[PDB]
Nucleic acid binder design. Structure first.
Ligand SMILES: [Cl-]
Ligand SMILES: [Cl-]
Ligand code: NA
Ligand code: NA
Lengths: 214, 208
DNA sequence: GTACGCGATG
DNA sequence: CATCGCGTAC
C-alpha cells in the first residue's frame, strides 16, 4: 500500500531511513501520545499503551501489515506484537536513565514471589528510553542478551519484588540488570534527542463538539 | 453543584440517551487490542462524561485541571468534586475505591476512608439496558453509616492478582437503588463504525 | 472468581 | 524514600 516503506529487528535498527525517521519524528509522535494520555498536563501510565501502537506501527511501516501480527489480547503478559511470527515485548520509560521498569503488573505479595520463582526472559525487547529535552534512545535487546544477564546474576538480583508497605504497581527488573541488558555489545540502539515541538491540543474538544452538534 | 439539573432536563437526557452509547463505543475502539478492551478505556470514558458536564454547565463552571493520578476526584462542578466511575456487566460488580493492592496500605484505607464526593456511575450493558447514575455524597454516607466500613469496603484478596480495594456488591446495590439516587436509563445499542488503531501511526511514519 | 495490561511523578 | 490513575474477560 501507499504508506509502506519503499534477524528482522537487526535489519530495522540498521535501516538508514528508519534511523532518520525515528531520530527526526519519534519525539513528535510520542508528544502526540502524551497529549492524548494526560490530565492537567500530567501523563498517565496508559500513555504506554499508545506509545506501543506507535512502535508496532513502525514495524508495519517497514515490514508490511501481512508480516506484523498486532492481534494479541490487550491483557496478554509480556508479548505486545509479533514480527514474522516472533514475539516482541515493547517497554517505554521516562527519565535521565531508565529505572523501575515492570516485568509484570502484579503487586500481590504471594503472586509476586511466584513470579520471581518461575519467570525468566523469553522475548526480544524494544525499549524506548525517553528523556525530554535531552538524550535517550530506542533499544533492541535480544532475548539471548536478557538470558545471558539473568543466567549470570540470578533471579534474586535480576527481579525486584514490590516493596511491602508501600503502594507500588508491579514486579520490576532491577536497575543493575536493566543497565546491563541495555549496554551489552549485542544490544542495538538508535540514539534520540527528545526535542519538544510546539504542538497543542485540547483533549475535551472532540467530545464537547459531539455533545453540542445538532 | 446543580448535577440534579442534568438528571431532570428532558432535552439533555434525550441527547445522552441517543449519543452516549456511540461515544462509549468509540472509546472502546480506541482502547482495545485484538478486540479486547483495556482498563484504560475508563480514562477515555471519563473525558466523555466531563465533556457532557462542560456542555451542560459551561467551561467556567467545570474544572478539569486535576492531576491524572488524583485520588477519587475526576472533575469539579461549581467547585464541588465529582468522582466518575464506569463498569460493564449485567449488574455493576467489583467497582474500585482505590487502585491499591498492597495489603497494609489497603487495610489503612479500610480503616480511614469514608465517602465524601458526589458520584457519577455509568453502568454499561451492551445490547441491553444500563444507566447513568447520580449518587449523591449523602446517599453513600448514609449507607456507609448504616452498614459500616467492614461491609462497605472489600479488601483485595491475598494470594490472587487483583487491582484494588472495592466497594462491596451489597453496598453498591444499596447506593445505586436508593430513592435519592437519580438516573438516566441507557439502551446500549452498538453502531456500525469502522476503525483501525494503527493506521494513523503507520501513515505518520510514511509522511514523516 | 481470578487472570492481566500500561510508568510518571512527589 | 515514596505516591497514584483506569475494569474487562476468561
Ligand atoms: Cl524486560
Ligand atoms: Cl464509590
Ligand atoms: Na509492553
Ligand atoms: Na474515576
Amino acid at each position: 500500500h501507499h504508506h509502506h516503506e519503499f534477524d528482522h529487528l537487526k535489519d530495522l535498527f540498521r535501516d538508514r531511513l528508519i534511523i532518520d525517521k525515528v531520530q527526526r519524528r519519534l519525539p513528535y509522535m510520542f508528544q502526540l501520545a502524551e497529549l492524548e494520555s494526560s490530565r492537567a498536563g500530567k501523563v498517565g501510565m496508559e500513555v504506554g499503551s499508545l506509545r506501543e501502537r506507535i512502535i508496532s506501527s513502525l514495524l508495519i511501516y517497514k515490514f508490511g501489515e501481512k508480516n506484523v501480527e498486532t492481534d494479541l489480547p490487550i491483557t496478554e503478559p509480556e508479548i505486545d506484537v509479533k514480527l514474522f511470527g516472533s514475539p516482541i515485548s515493547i517497554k517505554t520509560i521516562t527519565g535521565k536513565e531508565p529505572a523501575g521498569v515492570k516485568l509484570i503488573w502484579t503487586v500481590d505479595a504471594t503472586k509476586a514471589r511466584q513470579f520471581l520463582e518461575t519467570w525468566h526472559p523469553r522475548f526480544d525487547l524494544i525499549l524506548v528510553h525517553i528523556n525530554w529535552s535531552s538524550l535517550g534512545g530506542v533499544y533492541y535487546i535480544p532475548d539471548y542478551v536478557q538470558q545471558r544477564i539473568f543466567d549470570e546474576i540470578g533471579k534474586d538480583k535480576y527481579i525486584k519484588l514490590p516493596k511491602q508497605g508501600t503502594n507500588p504497581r508491579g514486579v520490576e527488573i532491577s536497575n543493575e540488570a536493566l543497565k546491563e541488558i541495555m549496554t551489552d555489545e549485542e544490544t542495538m540502539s538508535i540514539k534520540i534527542e527528545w526535542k519538544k515541538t510546539n504542538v497543542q491540543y485540547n483533549a475535551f474538544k472532540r467530545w464537547v463538539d459531539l455533545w453540542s452538534e445538532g
